Design a protein around this ligand. Sequence first.
Ligand SMILES: Cn1c(=O)ccn([C@@H]2O[C@H](COS(=O)(=O)NC(=O)[C@@H](N)CO)[C@@H](O)[C@H]2O)c1=O
Ligand SMILES: Cn1c(=O)ccn([C@@H]2O[C@H](COS(=O)(=O)NC(=O)[C@@H](N)CO)[C@@H](O)[C@H]2O)c1=O
Ligand code: NA
Ligand code: NA
Ligand code: NA
Ligand code: NA
Ligand code: NA
Ligand code: NA
Lengths: 454, 456
Amino acid sequence: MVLDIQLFRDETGANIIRESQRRRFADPDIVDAIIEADKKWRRTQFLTEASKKLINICSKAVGAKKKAKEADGDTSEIPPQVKEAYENGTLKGEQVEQLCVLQLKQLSKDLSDQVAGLAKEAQQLEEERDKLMLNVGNILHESVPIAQDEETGNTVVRTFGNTTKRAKLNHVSIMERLGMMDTSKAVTSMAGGRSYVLKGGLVQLQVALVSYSLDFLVKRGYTPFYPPFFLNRDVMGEVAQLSQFDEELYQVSGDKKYLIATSEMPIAAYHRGRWFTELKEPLKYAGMSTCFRKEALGIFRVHQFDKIEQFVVCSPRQEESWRHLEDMITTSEEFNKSLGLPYRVVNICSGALNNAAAKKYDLEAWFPASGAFRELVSCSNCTDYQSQSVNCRYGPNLRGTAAVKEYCHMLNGTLCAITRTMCCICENYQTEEGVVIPDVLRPYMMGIEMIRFE
Amino acid sequence: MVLDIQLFRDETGANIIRESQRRRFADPDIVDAIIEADKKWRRTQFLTEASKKLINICSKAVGAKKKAKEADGDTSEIPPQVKEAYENGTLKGEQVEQLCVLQLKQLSKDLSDQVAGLAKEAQQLEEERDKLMLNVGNILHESVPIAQDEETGNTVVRTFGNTTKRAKLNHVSIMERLGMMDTSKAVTSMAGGRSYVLKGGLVQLQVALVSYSLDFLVKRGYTPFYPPFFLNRDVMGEVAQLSQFDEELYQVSGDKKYLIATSEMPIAAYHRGRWFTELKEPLKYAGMSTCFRKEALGIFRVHQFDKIEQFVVCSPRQEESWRHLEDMITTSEEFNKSLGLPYRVVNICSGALNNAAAKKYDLEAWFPASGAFRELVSCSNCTDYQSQSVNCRYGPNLRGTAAQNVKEYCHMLNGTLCAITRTMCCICENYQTEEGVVIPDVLRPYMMGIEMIRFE
Ligand SMILES: Cn1c(=O)ccn([C@@H]2O[C@H](COS(=O)(=O)NC(=O)[C@@H](N)CO)[C@@H](O)[C@H]2O)c1=O
Ligand SMILES: Cn1c(=O)ccn([C@@H]2O[C@H](COS(=O)(=O)NC(=O)[C@@H](N)CO)[C@@H](O)[C@H]2O)c1=O
Ligand code: NA
Ligand code: NA
Ligand code: NA
Ligand code: NA
Ligand code: NA
Ligand code: NA
């Protein structure tokens, strides 16, 4: 499953999607292609259900005839009119009951063959529909800036700290001069491009950030969550876009699995097929994992890195998820303030948003030696988009309920991308002697106040 | 390279290896098979060197004759006695100079063909020699118990705490009742068999153990080391036996790589092609990594787990590595004593040792509800076995040093400090009450001062 079809079948709903597509500078005609694919699919289903019912009538009519000792009949040959009627979904049970046992047996096999063919057609139409749904963006929030390009289109909403100060050495030079980061051929000849070894004080800093970040979220009511780092193909497909398989995900062979690019992937997948009748309190998770990205200088952009993640599952009602999005970006802001790191928060323009996000805020920290704002955090409200894909339902779940389906809302937000935060700390806390440890991290690394240049 | 050939070429050295093979219940005949392959290899090299010199004589002779403007000659045919002589390694330079330019050009090509043929033979002999070397165990320490079966053959060296203690619930039952571990189909249908999710207090305990273990080693002079979790095929081959690729290692495709089974693999590989003239102080690394094992209830035996590792690179002289082995097992013991976990330390029997280990100590903690000693730690002295494979040299080079007749290699050791999920299982059984799991005192500052994690 990719998206629920329900909004596409509704005239008003389809227009909401077309409008959102236009506002994202995406194709509104994808809605119409989905409606058409679904129309063809609904036709295979109408015929399948009609023919399944007629198969049961054949079985019951044969049973009645056998009990009555009616002769089996002259022939099994099916009238062309009967074949035309079941192919068009107009064959009535009263007409089927006019056939002899031999014809009823032949018809049951013919209808079973038709159901088998219609199932193959339906599977192809579901594949076409699903491929189109992957190109449908989530319905934009009304506050999303309307623009194609990030450089001019994104809106700066807040800033913190000294964002104009400059510094001498960039994070690459600092980590080299500490003697605590190795990205030389000794490492890349054994592990490939962009691989690294961290030593001594930088490992202590890495662990101090992992533990401080986890405690920061525990204090805010998040439940720590340590996931498996592998996901099977089917499950990864529900939490990843098709473009992620070719550009971002490593394949593991032990069956075929994929390494996770973020704990958001197994946390969202952990909710698949779930149904929360009510969520008076949201589900809040502090994901902790290594992240693996194929990405097809230093430790700013690497294939392997730790990240502490915020993940929320909440009620889709009363715009509650929008309140959670504000709390999640505020949490990431408070985290950076606690580390004394200057930054700006940016509202991502419509054209730059990934399909699952209805709105996204990035926190870009100031790197004084690099002289630039660099992304440390992304916080998104995915509303019911991922829930539709993992099939995470919401609402009353009682016996006797017939065919609007409600889904939970889901949000995800970086709390700390460990290696990038280390790069940021190094630039902001450098001195002539080394790197000053931010105050809040000192208890998490044996009270160490500074890591020295070698 | 698998092993250096030098000890096999020495009569005393070959006898030391045959004895060690017998004491490990391995084949001593492998030594003799290696000697024979190397004898055939040395013959290909003798002929190669002789023929390379003759190729240079051909080049020099063609040069001198052409500078003197001599005619090319009437034939390129090589006298049968010349072909017989170079094939036997007896062709003299004086016989070569007597040939004309045309014959010298033909001979240089024929000798180059012979060198190409001899290189193919040498490569086939190197493959044969290396395959045999993979079945040669490291020279056993004289204190290793001689037995084939781990079940009855290991020797108990030391015990700590109440190793007869009994408890109510096993680690699986405890982690289930805490509501902090999920090994159900909600996880296994996502990530395959033996996959798990940890939540809440158990993740806090997991992080507390990682951080306390790292600090425990920093305080003991180890340098923290965070490695890449991938190794390419060639490099993994130097730090893993062929049986590990089949049974233990996941393959990753992004240039084919392998997920590490332990930080011991990238730390050993990080020393490939290195040469230390002296190691007055050893290199001590505190490896920190996730570990991935194919393994072809609960979180005791899983594919994915954190482990804090001790790794030492030291001088091969004066049996210094044997002192480090004792320090490393003592470090793992002091760690488990600080957590208050009862255990026994065993000296692994000869038949159970992996090929790289000259000796191994396991620390098996007592699980009071399970009612069994269960391996938490392995500490091994690999002496120069892994160093020969990664080519990590020590001391003076052979040339220009009259006193140096042997190629020296560093010694390497590795030892678990903390296998995080198994230690969590042990803590749960040992610290359970009717309300939940008491946090060992030393870990409380590493998990927000929490004294107990409660049953759901
Ligand atoms: C080292 N490194 C990279 O090479 C690439 C990205 N990042 C940081 O990861 C943060 C989160 O990545 S994301 O923007 O794709 N969003 C997620 O994964 C969501 N689940 C929310 O976390 C980025 O903001 C980069 O700072 C690295 O650190
Ligand atoms: C969860 N789990 C496993 O499933 C398998 C093993 N272990 C622990 O890892 C320790 C070290 O593994 S080892 O014996 O193969 N030795 C090494 O890897 C060396 N580098 C020394 O660490 C074992 O003692 C198990 O307790 C798991 O925890
Ligand atoms: Na820079
Ligand atoms: Na981002
Ligand atoms: Na006892
Ligand atoms: Na048990
Ligand atoms: Na072991
Ligand atoms: Na010498």
